[PDB]
Write a protein that holds these residues in place. Sequence first.
Motif, PDB file in Angstrom:
ATOM      1  N   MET A  12       0.838  -1.187   0.000  1.00 42.37           N
ATOM      2  CA  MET A  12       0.000   0.000   0.000  1.00 42.37           C
ATOM      3  C   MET A  12       0.876   1.241   0.000  1.00 42.37           C
ATOM      4  O   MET A  12       0.594   2.172  -0.744  1.00 42.37           O
ATOM      5  N   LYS A  13       2.031   1.191   0.674  1.00 41.09           N
ATOM      6  CA  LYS A  13       2.921   2.329   0.618  1.00 41.09           C
ATOM      7  C   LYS A  13       3.576   2.421  -0.761  1.00 41.09           C
ATOM      8  O   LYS A  13       3.705   3.514  -1.294  1.00 41.09           O
ATOM      9  N   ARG A  14       4.011   1.291  -1.334  1.00 41.44           N
ATOM     10  CA  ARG A  14       4.620   1.242  -2.668  1.00 41.44           C
ATOM     11  C   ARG A  14       3.721   1.919  -3.703  1.00 41.44           C
ATOM     12  O   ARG A  14       4.208   2.685  -4.541  1.00 41.44           O
ATOM     13  N   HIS A  15       2.405   1.669  -3.585  1.00 39.91           N
ATOM     14  CA  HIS A  15       1.405   2.126  -4.533  1.00 39.91           C
ATOM     15  C   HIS A  15       0.857   3.518  -4.208  1.00 39.91           C
ATOM     16  O   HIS A  15       0.051   4.052  -4.986  1.00 39.91           O
ATOM     17  N   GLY A  16       1.289   4.148  -3.103  1.00 36.89           N
ATOM     18  CA  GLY A  16       0.987   5.568  -2.893  1.00 36.89           C
ATOM     19  C   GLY A  16      -0.181   5.913  -1.959  1.00 36.89           C
ATOM     20  O   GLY A  16      -0.618   7.067  -1.943  1.00 36.89           O
ATOM     21  N   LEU A  17      -0.593   4.971  -1.093  1.00 36.94           N
ATOM     22  CA  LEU A  17      -1.717   5.219  -0.179  1.00 36.94           C
ATOM     23  C   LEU A  17      -1.275   5.932   1.095  1.00 36.94           C
ATOM     24  O   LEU A  17      -2.107   6.512   1.780  1.00 36.94           O
ATOM     25  N   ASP A  18       0.008   5.897   1.463  1.00 41.22           N
ATOM     26  CA  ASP A  18       0.384   6.538   2.714  1.00 41.22           C
ATOM     27  C   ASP A  18       0.155   8.046   2.639  1.00 41.22           C
ATOM     28  O   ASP A  18       0.813   8.730   1.857  1.00 41.22           O
ATOM     29  N   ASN A  19      -0.731   8.540   3.506  1.00 41.12           N
ATOM     30  CA  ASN A  19      -1.068   9.952   3.584  1.00 41.12           C
ATOM     31  C   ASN A  19      -1.836  10.416   2.338  1.00 41.12           C
ATOM     32  O   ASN A  19      -1.978  11.615   2.091  1.00 41.12           O
ATOM     33  N   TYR A  20      -2.386   9.471   1.572  1.00 45.34           N
ATOM     34  CA  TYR A  20      -3.198   9.874   0.433  1.00 45.34           C
ATOM     35  C   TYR A  20      -4.486  10.546   0.932  1.00 45.34           C
ATOM     36  O   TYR A  20      -5.168  10.036   1.799  1.00 45.34           O
ATOM     37  N   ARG A  21      -4.763  11.767   0.450  1.00 42.73           N
ATOM     38  CA  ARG A  21      -5.896  12.552   0.941  1.00 42.73           C
ATOM     39  C   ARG A  21      -5.847  12.727   2.465  1.00 42.73           C
ATOM     40  O   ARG A  21      -6.856  13.032   3.098  1.00 42.73           O
ATOM     41  N   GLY A  22      -4.639  12.660   3.024  1.00 46.50           N
ATOM     42  CA  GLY A  22      -4.430  12.929   4.435  1.00 46.50           C
ATOM     43  C   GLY A  22      -4.651  11.712   5.332  1.00 46.50           C
ATOM     44  O   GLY A  22      -4.501  11.831   6.554  1.00 46.50           O
ATOM     45  N   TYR A  23      -4.923  10.543   4.737  1.00 47.15           N
ATOM     46  CA  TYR A  23      -5.140   9.324   5.514  1.00 47.15           C
ATOM     47  C   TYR A  23      -3.836   8.544   5.629  1.00 47.15           C
ATOM     48  O   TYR A  23      -3.333   8.032   4.642  1.00 47.15           O
ATOM     49  N   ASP A  87      -2.215  -8.926  -7.398  1.00 50.29           N
ATOM     50  CA  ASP A  87      -1.606  -7.619  -7.637  1.00 50.29           C
ATOM     51  C   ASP A  87      -2.644  -6.564  -7.259  1.00 50.29           C
ATOM     52  O   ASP A  87      -3.699  -6.514  -7.880  1.00 50.29           O
ATOM     53  N   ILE A  88      -2.361  -5.757  -6.235  1.00 50.80           N
ATOM     54  CA  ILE A  88      -3.350  -4.825  -5.709  1.00 50.80           C
ATOM     55  C   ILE A  88      -3.372  -3.501  -6.470  1.00 50.80           C
ATOM     56  O   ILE A  88      -4.147  -2.637  -6.068  1.00 50.80           O
ATOM     57  N   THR A  89      -2.659  -3.377  -7.601  1.00 48.61           N
ATOM     58  CA  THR A  89      -2.600  -2.129  -8.354  1.00 48.61           C
ATOM     59  C   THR A  89      -4.001  -1.547  -8.619  1.00 48.61           C
ATOM     60  O   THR A  89      -4.295  -0.360  -8.387  1.00 48.61           O
ATOM     61  N   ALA A  90      -4.867  -2.359  -9.244  1.00 48.54           N
ATOM     62  CA  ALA A  90      -6.188  -1.916  -9.635  1.00 48.54           C
ATOM     63  C   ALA A  90      -7.012  -1.471  -8.420  1.00 48.54           C
ATOM     64  O   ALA A  90      -7.673  -0.423  -8.512  1.00 48.54           O
ATOM     65  N   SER A  91      -6.938  -2.246  -7.322  1.00 45.71           N
ATOM     66  CA  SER A  91      -7.685  -1.894  -6.127  1.00 45.71           C
ATOM     67  C   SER A  91      -7.193  -0.586  -5.546  1.00 45.71           C
ATOM     68  O   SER A  91      -8.007   0.254  -5.131  1.00 45.71           O
ATOM     69  N   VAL A  92      -5.875  -0.358  -5.583  1.00 52.49           N
ATOM     70  CA  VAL A  92      -5.372   0.875  -5.013  1.00 52.49           C
ATOM     71  C   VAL A  92      -5.785   2.071  -5.858  1.00 52.49           C
ATOM     72  O   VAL A  92      -6.200   3.132  -5.370  1.00 52.49           O
ATOM     73  N   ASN A  93      -5.688   1.953  -7.197  1.00 59.97           N
ATOM     74  CA  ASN A  93      -5.987   3.052  -8.081  1.00 59.97           C
ATOM     75  C   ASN A  93      -7.451   3.406  -7.967  1.00 59.97           C
ATOM     76  O   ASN A  93      -7.771   4.578  -7.946  1.00 59.97           O
ATOM     77  N   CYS A  94      -8.282   2.378  -7.825  1.00 58.95           N
ATOM     78  CA  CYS A  94      -9.695   2.632  -7.651  1.00 58.95           C
ATOM     79  C   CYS A  94     -10.002   3.283  -6.305  1.00 58.95           C
ATOM     80  O   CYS A  94     -10.803   4.212  -6.179  1.00 58.95           O
ATOM     81  N   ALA A  95      -9.352   2.776  -5.247  1.00 55.39           N
ATOM     82  CA  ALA A  95      -9.491   3.328  -3.910  1.00 55.39           C
ATOM     83  C   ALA A  95      -9.163   4.814  -3.876  1.00 55.39           C
ATOM     84  O   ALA A  95      -9.792   5.571  -3.147  1.00 55.39           O
ATOM     85  N   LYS A  96      -8.136   5.197  -4.629  1.00 51.32           N
ATOM     86  CA  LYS A  96      -7.774   6.608  -4.689  1.00 51.32           C
ATOM     87  C   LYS A  96      -8.920   7.433  -5.278  1.00 51.32           C
ATOM     88  O   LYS A  96      -9.182   8.547  -4.829  1.00 51.32           O
ATOM     89  N   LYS A  97      -9.662   6.873  -6.237  1.00 47.29           N
ATOM     90  CA  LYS A  97     -10.782   7.649  -6.764  1.00 47.29           C
ATOM     91  C   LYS A  97     -11.936   7.677  -5.761  1.00 47.29           C
ATOM     92  O   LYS A  97     -12.679   8.650  -5.661  1.00 47.29           O
ATOM     93  N   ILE A  98     -12.158   6.570  -5.068  1.00 47.23           N
ATOM     94  CA  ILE A  98     -13.200   6.505  -4.068  1.00 47.23           C
ATOM     95  C   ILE A  98     -12.961   7.517  -2.964  1.00 47.23           C
ATOM     96  O   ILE A  98     -13.889   8.267  -2.577  1.00 47.23           O
ATOM     97  N   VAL A  99     -11.737   7.551  -2.432  1.00 47.44           N
ATOM     98  CA  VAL A  99     -11.497   8.410  -1.277  1.00 47.44           C
ATOM     99  C   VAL A  99     -11.482   9.899  -1.654  1.00 47.44           C
ATOM    100  O   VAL A  99     -11.517  10.726  -0.765  1.00 47.44           O
ATOM    101  N   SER A 100     -11.405  10.199  -2.957  1.00 49.16           N
ATOM    102  CA  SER A 100     -11.394  11.564  -3.445  1.00 49.16           C
ATOM    103  C   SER A 100     -12.812  12.041  -3.741  1.00 49.16           C
ATOM    104  O   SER A 100     -12.980  13.188  -4.145  1.00 49.16           O
ATOM    105  N   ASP A 101     -13.804  11.147  -3.643  1.00 43.49           N
ATOM    106  CA  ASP A 101     -15.147  11.363  -4.185  1.00 43.49           C
ATOM    107  C   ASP A 101     -16.024  12.333  -3.384  1.00 43.49           C
ATOM    108  O   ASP A 101     -17.004  12.873  -3.913  1.00 43.49           O
ATOM    109  N   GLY A 102     -15.681  12.594  -2.122  1.00 43.14           N
ATOM    110  CA  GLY A 102     -16.439  13.570  -1.328  1.00 43.14           C
ATOM    111  C   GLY A 102     -16.515  13.207   0.172  1.00 43.14           C
ATOM    112  O   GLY A 102     -16.333  14.077   1.042  1.00 43.14           O
TER     113      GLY A 102
END
Length: 129
Positions: A12-23, A87-102
């Motif tokens: 999750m850190k490799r794929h950019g979730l650490d502190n993504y949108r402040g989480y 490979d969690i790539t797709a799940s992470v990329n999608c999660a980034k759109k979800i957490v940005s949604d509002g």
Amino acid sequence: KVFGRCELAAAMKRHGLDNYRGYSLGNWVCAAKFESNFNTQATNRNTDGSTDYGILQINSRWWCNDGRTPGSRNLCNIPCSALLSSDITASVNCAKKIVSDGNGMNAWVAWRNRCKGTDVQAWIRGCRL
Ligand code: NA
């Protein structure tokens, strides 16, 4: 694939979730724990007839296509089966759109009920990050 805690933290850190949108990273590990038990293959049917898929339980009403959720959206532009990959790539990329949604991470009911407001840093304790 069933991830170990620190193994998933690293991915999750490799794929950019650490502190993504402040989480911070521990929020994402805690979410995965209680959504999927760290299992990429987890699926769960919902009452509205959508299904949640993968390590972050991404819903077919909005985010992916599963062929059986009428009138639904596919905002991550992906088949829901892609979210079950080792490979969690797709799940992470999608999660980034979800957490940005509002609503931020409130999109994840297990996060809201079991992670939010808690000592989430515990979920990365001991890991080599
Ligand atoms: Na869909």
